[model samples]
Target: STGSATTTPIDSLDDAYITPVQIGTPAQTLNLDFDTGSSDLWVFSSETTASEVDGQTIYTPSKSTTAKLLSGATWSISYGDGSSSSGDVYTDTVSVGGLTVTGQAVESAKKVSSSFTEDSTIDGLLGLAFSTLNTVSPTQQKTFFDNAKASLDSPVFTADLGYHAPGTYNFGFIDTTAYTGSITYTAVSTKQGFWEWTSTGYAVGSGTFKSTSIDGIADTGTTLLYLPATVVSAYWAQVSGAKSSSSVGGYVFPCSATLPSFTFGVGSARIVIPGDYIDFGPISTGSSSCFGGIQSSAGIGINIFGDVALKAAFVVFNGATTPTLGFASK
Candidate 1:
C-alpha cells in the first residue's frame, strides 16, 4: 500500500511544513507539522485549556466515536530549547494522505508551553523519526509511520520540501519525477533515535569541497541549517557585512548583500543550496540586517540539516531492517 500528501510552507520564511491529516470517525482534519526530528503524533485538542489556546485548530476526541482513552497512559516531551508539552493519550483511527491506521496513539495536549501557544499556524506535530523517541510511557506506543509500516509496500517515505511553495510527502515509494539526477544513499544511525548520518564534505559557494565528515540529523521540524562553527563562519565570511550577533540570536548580514550558495556531499551527490535560501529574511519587518538561514551548531551539540538544506533536494527515509537515507537533487 502507498499514500501521499501535500505539504505547504506555513510562513514566508518556510519556517515549517504543514500537512492535512484526518483523525477520528467523521474525520476532523488538522494541519500538522510532519516533523522528522522527534517521534510522537500529538495534537492540540479539546482537552487543552482555552487560556493556552490561540487561533489554532483543536481536535475534539470526545466527538469521535472511535476515540478511546488509552487508560493510565501519559506522555511529555521537551525540545532542545527547553519548551515542552504534556498530555493524555487516546487510541483512534488516523489517516494521512489516505493511509489509515486504526488504534493509532493520538496524544491529546492537556497543557502546552507559551512557545507553542504563541504559534497559531501549526495545530500539532506528526513525528516521523524512529519510534524509540516516542514520549508515551507505561506502554510506549508506535508512531503513525511505524504502525502503518507493515502495510506499506516498501517501508519507505519521502519528503520534498519547497521554498515558499507546496511540496509532497510520499509513503511506500519514491516519486521519480519529484527529483532529478541520481539518488545517493547514506547509512543512518538510529541509536540516537534520529535520522543521523555523516556527510562526506562541504563546499562554500563555488569553492572546492573540503574533505571532512560532518555528522548531523535531517530534521524537517527545524527551520534553519546549522553546521560546525568553522563551516558556518567560512560561509559567512564570503558576505561583505556578515557578523555573528548574539543579540539577534545568530549570524546576521546586510539584507542587500549577495550571499553564496552552500553545497554538501552525500556519497557522490552534491546538493547545492541556493544563495537566496541562505539569505533568509530581514531581522525585522523593515530592518536592513537579515538573519542567516545557516548558523553555527555549537550551541545545539549536533549539527542539523533542517528545512534550509532539505528544501534544496528530495529526501527519502528508508525503514528497511538496515535503514538508509537517500538524497537526490531536485
Candidate 2:
C-alpha cells in the first residue's frame, strides 16, 4: 500500500556540498565531498596558505571555541583520481543536521591543488562508505557512523539515491516507513576497505546471459556503470541487429529504439538497470550514435556498479551494528 505522504525531497545544491560533523561548535561549516570509495574526514585549515586553501572550505580552529589540535600527529590522504592532501590532526566538537558528536578526529590539509581551491562550495568529504579504507589509523579510526553509533536509537545508516529528485542520504537510523514488505538483506564479507562481492550472473529483458558469469563491487561514489569487456561485448550482441562501434569508446546502438532491461544478482535480489540509463548524453559521433551505460573497463581489473544500479534499490550500509550490507525497495 503506497502511503499518501511523500518522502522529503533531498535538496541538490549546484555549488553547495554536505558538511561533515566534527568536534566543534557551528561557527563555520566544512564543505566536503561525499565519497563512497574512501573513508576519511578531512578539511583545509586557516593555517594553510592561500594557495593550499583556495577553493575548498577551510575550518578555522580559533573561530570554534571547542576546537583542539593534536600535539604532534599529522595526516594525509590519496584518492583513486591520483589527487592527494596532507595535514595535521585535530579534535573538536562537531555537528551535522542538529546531531552533535564529541571528540571527533578531523584532518587539516597543509597542501591542496587548484581544483580543490576552486570548488569553494565543498568543505571536505564525509566518507559514509566504510571505515576499513579510512585514512585514520586503527587506534584512532572513527567515522561518522562510529561517532553516532552508540547514541543512535537504531544502529543503521541508509542512502536513498533519489529517482527524479535528489536522493535523501540519511545516517543513524533506517526509516522503515520508506520501505515495504520484508527487507532483503545481504551479509558483507570482512574485507579491508572496499565493499566487494562476487556476482552470480546478469539478466536482460526476458533473456539471461549464461556464457560467463559477472563479478564486481557496487560503489555509490561513481556516476557510471563499468563492466567487463567480454560481458559487455556478449550483452551488446543481444540487441536486435546491433553492431559494436568505436564511436562512444564501447558499444553504440541505434538512438531511435528503446534498449533492453538488465539485472545483476546479489544474493537472491536481482538488481535491475533500466534501458533509459543506457542512453546517456548527446551523441559525440553521429546522429544514430548513443552511449551505452555499460562501459568496457577490462584493464581496470574490477567492474563497478555505479549510480545506474544503485538508483533501482534502497541500499543500507550496516557498518555499526551487524557489519553487514542490506538492500530493499525504495
Candidate 3:
C-alpha cells in the first residue's frame, strides 16, 4: 500500500509544517506536525482542559465509534524546548492521505503546555521516529508509520519540505519525479530513537568542504539548522554585519546582508542550501536585523538538521532490515 499527503508550512519562517490526518469512524480531520525527532501520535482532544484549549481543533474520541480506550494506559512527553503534553491512550482507525491503519494508538491529550496552546497552527504531533521513543507506560505503542510499514510496498516514507510552499510526505514508495539526481544512501542509528546520522562535512558558500564528521538528527519537529559552534561561527564570520547577540538570543545580521549558501555532504553527495533560505526573515516586526536560520548547537546536546536543512532536499526514511536514510536534491 502507498499513501501521499500534502504538508503546508505555517509561515514564511517555516515554523512548523502540518499535514492533515483523519482519525476515527466519522473521520475527524486534524492538522498535525509530522515530527521525525519524537515518537508519540498525540493530539488535542475533548479530554484537554477547557482553559488550555485555544483555536485548534480537538479530537473527540467519544464521537468516534471505532475509538477504544487502552485501559490503564497513560503517556507523557517533554520536548527539548520544555514544551510538554500528557494524556490517556486510545486505539482508533487512523488514516493519512489514502493509507489507513486500524487500531493505531491515538494519544488524547489531557494536559498541554502554554507553547502548544498558543500555537493554533497545529492540533497535535505525528511522531515518525522509532517506536522505542514512545512514552506510553506498561506497553509501548507503534507509530502510524511502523504499524503500516509491513503492508507498504517498500516499508519507507519520504519527506519533501518546501521553502515557502506546500510539499509532500509520501509513504511506501519514492516519488521519482520529485527529486533530481540519484539518491544518496547513508546509515542511520536509531539507538537514540531518532533518525540520527553522521554528516561527512560542510562548506560555507563556495569555500572548501571541511571533512568534519558531524552527528545530528533529521528533525522536522525543529525549526532551524543547528550545528557546532565552530561551524556556525565560521559561516557567520563570512557575513559582514553578522554577530552573536545575547539580547537577540542568537546570531543576527542586517536584513539586507548578502548571505552565503551552505552545503553539507551525505557520503559522496552534497546538498546545498540557498542563501535566501538562511535569511529567516527579520528579527522583529519591520526590523532591519534578521535572525539566522543556522545557529550554534552548543547547549542542544545534538546537532539538529531541522526544517531549514530538510527543506533543501528530499529525505527518505527507510525502515527495512537495517535502517537507512536517503537524500536527493530537488
Candidate 4:
C-alpha cells in the first residue's frame, strides 16, 4: 500500500536529497535526486556523448530487454539554478522504494548543461511533481507517481527533507511517528502544475504576524525559501550585520549573529522555523559571512517554500479531489 525510501543530503551543496532507484530489467541502481519542482524522470544515458558525460554511470537502455524508444518523442527541461537537460524518450520499467511502475517514461539525456554533468553526486532526477509539468513533446508523459497512484492505498506522497542528514519520502501513506503537533491542511491551487497555496501570514524573527496572503509553491528541489523582497528584508533587518551583498549575490550577514525564529500560519497551526535553520551556514568554509536560507524571489512571480522551509516540518501532498497540503512540526 505504501512505499518509502531514505533521502540523504549531499555534502556541502545541501541542495539535493538523493534516493536510490533501479532502472530496467536486470535493475541498474542509481542515486537520483527526487525533485518536486519539475516533472521529468531524466538521466544521463548511453545516448549521451562521451564529452558531455562525467563520472556518472550511464543507463544503457540497449541492455534492458523491456526498454523501447517512445519514437517521435523528445524532451527538454530547465531548472531555476540554470541547470538543463534534453533528451529522447524511452519506455522502461522503473522501481523505487520497493514499488514498481512499468512502462514509465524515461528521458535519456543526450545533452546537458555543465551544472548537471559536473555534479558527481546526482546521476539523475526522479520528478515527484504533477505530470502536467512534464516536457515530452507530441505527447506529454506521466510521472511514476501518477502511474502508480491507483494501486496505492491512498493517493498521497510526503517529503521529509533534512539538513545534511537522512530523511524519508513516503508514498501512499503517513507515519504518525514522523512528526509532532496537529497537522494543518491548506487547499492547493494546481492550475500551474505546482503545489501552490496561500498562507494566511508569516512572522519574521518573533516579529508580529501579519494578515498578508503569500502565494507560494512547495518545492523540494529549491535550496532556499524565496519570498517577497520586503518580507526577506524584514527578517534580514533583525540580523546585526546582515546586508544584501552583490558580491555574494544574496543576503549575507555575520555567521555569529543570533537569529530568531521564523514562523508562518497554516490555518490555525503555527509552523515555526528555528533560528539556526535560518542561518544556513557560512558562505565560505571558515568565513564569518553566512548566507540566509530565506532569500528574495523578485524576478519570479510566485514565491517558493523551498527545502529550507519545508524541512522544518513534515509535509503532505494529497492527490485528491481537493488536493490539499498538510504541514506539521517535526
Measured over all alpha carbons after superposition, the RMSD of each candidate to the real structure, in angstroms, is 0.8, 5.1, 0.8, 1.4
lDDT by residue for model 4 (56-114), tens: 87899999999999999999998888889999999999988988889999999999999
| Predicted candidate 2 versus true structure: per-residue lDDT over 128-212, tens digit per residue | 6567666654245577666777776656666666544555556666778766554566655546466565666777767864534
Q: Write the per-residue lDDT of candidate 1 for residues 1-330, one digit (tens) a residue.
A: 889999999888898899999999899999999999999999999999889999889999989999999999999999875778899999999999989999999999999999889989889999999999999999998988999999999999999999889999999889899999889999999999999999998999899999899999999999899999999999999999899998999999999898899999998779999999887788889999999999999978999999999999999999999999999999
Off by over 4 Å in 1: none
The TM-scores, one per candidate, come to 0.99, 0.78, 0.99, 0.96
Tell me the spans in candidate 2 whose CA falls farther than 4 Å from its real position: 1-23, 47-49, 52-55, 114-121, 137-140, 209-215, 235-259, 279-292, 320-322
Quick one: ranking by lDDT, best first? 3, 1, 4, 2
Report the number of clashing residue pairs per model: 0, 17, 0, 0
**Candidate number of the best lDDT:** 3
Q: Give the Å shift of residue 185 in candidate 4.
A: 0.9
What does the lDDT read for residue 176 in candidate 1? 93
Looking at model 4, the pairs that clash are none
lDDT of 2: 0.63
Consecutive 10-residue window with the lowest summed lDDT within model 1 = 78-87
Q: lDDT tens digits, residues 1-330, model 3? A: 999999999876788999999999999999999999999999999999989999999999999999999999999999988999999999999999899999999999999999999999899999999999999998899999999999999999999999989999999999999999999999999989999999999999999999989999999999999999999999999999999999988999899899999999999899999998898888889999999999999998999999999999999999998999999999
In order, the Cα lDDT scores of the candidates are 0.93, 0.63, 0.96, 0.88
Question: Cα deviation of 180 in candidate 1 (Å)?
Answer: 0.7
